[PDB]
Design a protein around this ligand. Structure first.
Ligand SMILES: NC(=O)c1cnc(N[C@@H]2CCCC[C@@H]2N)nc1Nc1cccc(-n2nccn2)c1
Length: 264
């Protein structure tokens, strides 16, 4: 659970930042060092929401064990609170495609299929991600994607099929209208993730407010087919963007459709 700060090296130059604080690269001496990515809570982890958001992520990651989900090494309590994870060496999918416009359609299918296998496992484990987007898919290699950023993720109780709540562009209508998050709402987000990936990390619904996205979706309109996107992958996006939750496919159906297409 708890790691020795003296066994952790952090590089000065951040990989990036969020509201939570910074992401730093380093290594942890567990033998052989392990390259790590570290979320460091800003301001000595003063904010109890941040600490819960780290713990939440930490607690979710701890419970999850799957090749397409980022693994946690532990928590280090030093200059700040640090969530220490296995390093996804090539970084977030949206950034990598933005800077590598040459990646082939076939390579993108392989990666989004890997995401669908991680999500299928999440759905089987009755977890809802609630932040599934290209920025929260991390590349280990050019051909190995993992899902990360479980800060908003919820372990569903056995007596429930959705989380009722107290990134709208990635949210299904029932999330916006009824505050209901299910594996089916994650399928909708996976639709937007696919559009992002075939759009080489472009933002969805460019220049639109959330309320305008809601209005467009209510009129039955959908984002157009990305340049070079195979028709079968745009068909699957549109299937993920099924308005009616009951008729939207789950990740079992999504993973099977991506598997069959990819391996043929
Ligand atoms: N390797 C991990 O285990 C890891 C887990 N989670 C995250 N989460 C971050 C939060 C901030 C947005 C981006 C992402 N969703 N990043 C990770 N690594 C990583 C590796 C290279 C670059 C970056 N990077 N580039 C810009 C910012 N961060 C991150």
């Amino acid at each position: 659970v708890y790691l020795d700060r003296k066994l952790l090296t952090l590089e000065d130059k951040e990989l990036g930042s969020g509201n939570f604080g910074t992401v730093k690269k380093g290594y942890y001496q567990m033998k052989v060092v392990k390259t790590v990515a570290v979320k460091i809570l800003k301001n000595e982890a003063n904010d109890p929401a941040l600490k819960d958001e780290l713990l939440a992520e930490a607690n979710v990651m701890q419970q999850l064990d799957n090749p397409y989900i980022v693994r946690m090494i532990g928590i280090c309590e030093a200059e700040s609170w640090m969530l220490v994870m296995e390093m996804a060496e090539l970084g977030p999918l949206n950034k990598y495609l933005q800077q590598n416009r040459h990646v082939k359609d076939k390579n993108i299918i392989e990666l989004v299929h890997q995401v669908s296998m991680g999500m299928k496992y999440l759905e089987e484990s009755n977890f809802v991600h609630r932040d599934l987007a290209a920025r929260n898919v991390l590349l280990v290699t050019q051909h190995y994607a993992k899902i990360s950023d479980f800060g908003l993720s919820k372990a569903l109780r056995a007596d429930e099929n959705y989380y009722k709540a107290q990134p709208v562009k990635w949210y299904a209508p029932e999330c916006i209208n009824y505050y209901k998050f299910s594996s089916k709402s994650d399928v909708w987000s996976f639709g937007v993730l696919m559009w992002e990936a075939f759009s080489y990390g472009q933002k969805p619904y460019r220049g639109m407010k959330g309320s305008e996205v809601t209005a467009m979706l209510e009129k039955g309109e959908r984002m157009g087919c990305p340049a070079g996107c195979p028709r079968e992958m745009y068909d699957l996006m549109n299937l993920c963007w099924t308005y009616d939750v009951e008729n939207r496919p789950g990740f079992a159906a999504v993973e099977l459709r991506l598997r069959n297409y990819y391996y043929d």
